[PDB]
């Protein structure tokens, strides 16, 4: 047949899953950000490790190198577009200062809770998974969607959603129908 | 209210018709049928229904918009003479063999 394909994993199991500090670390990260499992924490730790390893490798290179300059500035430009790094930390050492909590804060479910659209992180997740949240014009039901700044302000309730201006849901109209009958 | 937008209107004399891109805006509704779009297109172009062909309509993701491509033949006889047999069968101009 024809050529095979390259695909890879988005996460890696920790070196030791069983030290207690780790366990309660996933406990509070999950509880505060309202995740489903530790799989997402291993995911996010995986990319944070990749980013910090690249940043460290770029630090090892001497100042003004084509390599260090080009790729370091590209790390930081993209890390500021994602909103993780602020405009005033336009430096790679501050990339090395990063933590998982910032990425998790960039997850859409955090914003849906956070802006006031939802009153609990689990309620925010329910609203997202239930076709009530629109980033701009487009409906997202993935809590793991990470938000940009321009995308951060454009989080609203869906035109099709009952709370955003559409007709009442099945339950409301059913109750109204039985009340009329 | 459906709105039908026709762009890149290229008059093809050799096949004796006009070819174009049809963009259909249908807010708050599923989509517009090809008989339905043919009715509108022939109304717009002052041509018979048998002389109008429409196909390849893909709804843009998120809904509310579709894009397909359409033909308006100069005559119904020319439409029968040049159109594919299967498209003629779709519109009823030809019987399935």
């Amino acid at each position: 047949p024809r050529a095979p394909r390259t695909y890879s994993k988005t996460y890696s199991t920790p070196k030791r899953p069983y030290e207690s500090s780790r366990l309660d670390a996933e406990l509070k990260l999950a509880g505060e950000f309202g995740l489903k499992n530790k799989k997402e924490i291993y995911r996010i730790s995986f990319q944070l490790s990749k980013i910090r390893r690249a940043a460290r490798d770029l630090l090892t290179r001497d100042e003004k190198d084509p390599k260090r300059l080009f790729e370091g500035n590209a790390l930081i430009r993209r890390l500021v577009r994602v909103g993780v790094l602020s405009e005033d930390k336009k430096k790679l050492d501050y990339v090395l200062a990063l933590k998982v909590e910032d990425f998790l804060e960039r997850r859409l479910q955090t914003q849906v809770y956070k802006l006031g659209l939802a009153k609990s992180v689990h309620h925010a997740r329910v609203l997202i998974t239930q076709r009530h949240i629109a980033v701009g014009k487009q409906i997202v039901n993935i809590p793991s969607f990470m938000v940009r700044l321009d995308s951060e302000k454009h989080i609203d309730f869906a035109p099709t959603s009952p709370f955003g201006g559409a007709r009442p849901g099945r339950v409301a109209r059913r109750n109204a129908a039985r009340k009329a009958e | 209210a459906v709105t039908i937008r026709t762009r890149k209107v290229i008059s093809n004399p050799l096949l004796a018709r006009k070819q174009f891109v049809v963009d259909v805006l249908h807010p708050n509704r599923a989509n517009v049928s090809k008989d339905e779009l043919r009715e509108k297109l022939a109304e717009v172009y002052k041509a018979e229904k048998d002389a109008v062909s429409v196909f390849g309509f893909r709804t843009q993701f998120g809904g509310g918009k579709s894009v397909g491509f359409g033909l308006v033949y100069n005559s119904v006889a020319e439409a029968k003479k040049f159109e594919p047999t299967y498209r003629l069968v779709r519109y009823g101009l030809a019987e399935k063999v």
């Binding site: 084509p66 | 209107v9 290229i10």
Partner: protein, 31 residues
């Protein structure tokens, strides 16, 4: 400087008339 050398390198990698433009003109005339 490094950016310019890349552009100059790119321009090196990359009577006057375009075959597509002639086609587009027939397409436009038909239009």
């Amino acid at each position: 400087r490094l950016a310019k050398q890349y552009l100059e390198n790119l321009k090196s990698e990359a009577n006057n008339f375009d075959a597509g433009d002639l086609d587009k003109d027939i397409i436009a005339s038909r239009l």
